[PDB]
Amino acid sequence: FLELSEDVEEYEDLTEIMSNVQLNSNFLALARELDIMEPKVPDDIYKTHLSARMNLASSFVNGFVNAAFGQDKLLTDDGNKWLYKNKDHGMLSAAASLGMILLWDVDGGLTQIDKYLYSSEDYIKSGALLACGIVNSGVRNECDPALALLSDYVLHNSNTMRLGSIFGLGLAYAGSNREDVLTLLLPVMGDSKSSMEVAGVTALACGMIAVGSCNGDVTSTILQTIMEKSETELKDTYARWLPLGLGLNHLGKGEAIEAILAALEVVSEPFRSFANTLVDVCAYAGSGNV
Amino acid sequence: AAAGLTVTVTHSNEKHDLHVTSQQGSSEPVVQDLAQVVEEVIGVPQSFQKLIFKGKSLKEMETPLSALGIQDGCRVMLIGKKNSP
């Protein structure tokens, strides 16, 4: 999104078409004109002519097929029954898959996810919030409903609810480079109560928001959080998102990465040798550096 | 002495350019006045209706949105289900 002034002519249309507001309307219109609108069942994709996780995968692929459409009664009419029948950790992903169906559909998606927002299970609530972030992801909005919708959940004490909101804001503000969103999510990055993977997801959201921006305060917060976290618990299985955020923030820039790796040189070898390589390759992507 | 102001309410693919004014003795349109207009037009209760402006959450019923920064050409998002008691 290019942030400019209204002094230019036809500024309302320019910012709308830059915001991809008519993206969804045109995409559905062309899909109808191709007659490619019918919700393709995951079952006849599977060709079943001849289980909780398998049903979850079926829900995910159904959301993938019906993505950006918003026309799927499988998770709309009996969706509550499906998530209730679902087991353990998959209700969050099922709701996020519903948001995948409704992505780029701001008006329709928000109304059809508002009912699931007040759901009982924490996983369903977090999935609904992530569904909202997916819906507002990519497409830009004048009033930006995602920021107001994710108000208590942005720093909510519950790990799953905070995870869904943080990932949703990251997908929404991806490429927005918004100062307000950054100044609201980086303090969430600074939280110590959040788990290691929660901190990684915060870094992922910050990286995808400030991708290719060389956001100095984001990098300083990333490095400070890495330093404050102890190395033994750092290098286990989930700190691999902090270098990813660094690479995104310095994407396509190069040269200056020497300063970042020099600052990161204090880290122990098992994670430093991974992090410096990741940020280097992400920064030098699309260059052909033999 | 009507304090008219133009707001673009959007919800459920449906958009209206409402010229709303303060009615409950206030010098400027407020959350109470906007909620009353929304309830008259649709009927969503103030408990579960969600008005979103510039990504700022509406939680306080007495916060003046005219002071919060609504001007002509501003758009707001309405979230909820149309209830027909």
Element (H, E) at B17: strand B14-20
Q: What is the DSSP string of A4-68?
A: --TTSTTHHHHHHHHHTHHHHHHHHHHHHHTTTTS---HHHHHTTT--HHHHHHHHHHHHHHTTT
Phi, psi of A76 (to 5 degrees): -100, -55
How far does the CA of residue B67 sit from the closest CA of chain A (Å)? 17
> By C-alpha distance, which of A1, A110, A91, A79 is closest to A52?
A91
Technique that determined the structure: cryo-EM
- CB contact (8 A) between residue A143 and residue B75: yes
Cβ partners under 8 Å of residue A9, min gap 6: none
> By C-alpha distance, which of A174, A145, A206, A167 is closest to A1?
A174
Torsional sign, CA B49, B54, B55, B59? negative
Q: Could you tell me if A139 and A175 are in contact, meaning their C-beta atoms sit under 8 angstroms apart?
A: no
> By C-alpha distance, which of A188, A68, A200 is closest to A139?
A68
Q: d(Cα B49, Cα B59) in Å, to the nearest integer?
A: 10
Closest in B12, B56, B75 to A142, CB measured: B75
Q: d(Cα A7, Cα B3) in Å, to the nearest integer?
A: 26
How far does the CA of residue A49 sit from the closest CA of chain B (Å)? 40
Closest in A111, A147, A148 to B81, CB measured: A111
Which tokens is A103 given? 């992505």
Closest in A114, A115, A144 to B55, CB measured: A144
Q: d(Cα A15, Cα A141) in Å, to the nearest integer?
A: 9
3-class state of residue A177 by DSSP: coil
Q: d(Cα A55, Cα A85) in Å, to the nearest integer?
A: 10
Where does residue B70 rank: exposed (0-12), middle (13-18), buried (19+ CB within 10 A)?
buried
Q: Could you tell me if A129 and A150 are in contact, meaning their C-beta atoms sit under 8 angstroms apart?
A: yes
- Contacts with A, B 10-69, CB within 8 Å: 10-14, 48, 50, 52-59
Which tokens is A283 given? 């920064």
The owner of tokens 């660094």 is: A246
- The letter for the amino acid at A208 is M
Q: d(Cα A135, Cα A97) in Å, to the nearest integer?
A: 10
For residue B41, how many other CB atoms are within 10 A of its CB?
14
Give me Rg for the CA atoms of chain B. 12
Which tokens is A166 given? 């943080």
How far does the CA of residue B10 sit from the closest CA of chain A (Å)? 8
**Beta-sheet strand order (sheet of B56-57):** B14-20, B5-11, B74-79, B50-53, B56-57
Which tokens is B66 given? 């005219």
Where does residue A23 rank: exposed (0-12), middle (13-18), buried (19+ CB within 10 A)?
middle
Where does residue A14 rank: exposed (0-12), middle (13-18), buried (19+ CB within 10 A)?
middle
Q: d(Cα A57, Cα A69) in Å, to the nearest integer?
A: 19
- The letter for the amino acid at A22 is Q
Q: d(Cα A191, Cα A198) in Å, to the nearest integer?
A: 10
Residues facing B53 on adjacent strands: B56, B76
3-class state of residue B76 by DSSP: strand
Q: Could you tell me if A131 and A96 are in contact, meaning their C-beta atoms sit under 8 angstroms apart?
A: yes
User: Resolution (in Å) of the shown entry?
Assistant: 3.6
Q: d(Cα A34, Cα A205) in Å, to the nearest integer?
A: 36
For residue A245, how many other CB atoms are within 10 A of its CB?
30
The owner of tokens 């133009």 is: B6
DSSP conformational letter for B14: E
Q: d(Cα A61, Cα A57) in Å, to the nearest integer?
A: 6
Residues facing A121 on adjacent strands: none
DSSP conformational letter for B18: E
Residue A115 contacts B, CB cutoff 8 Å: yes
Q: Could you tell me if A78 and A59 are in contact, meaning their C-beta atoms sit under 8 angstroms apart?
A: no
Q: Output b/e per residue, A150-170; b: 16+ Cβ within 10 A.
A: bbebbbbeebbbbbbbbbbbb
Q: Could you tell me if B24 and A119 are in contact, meaning their C-beta atoms sit under 8 angstroms apart?
A: no
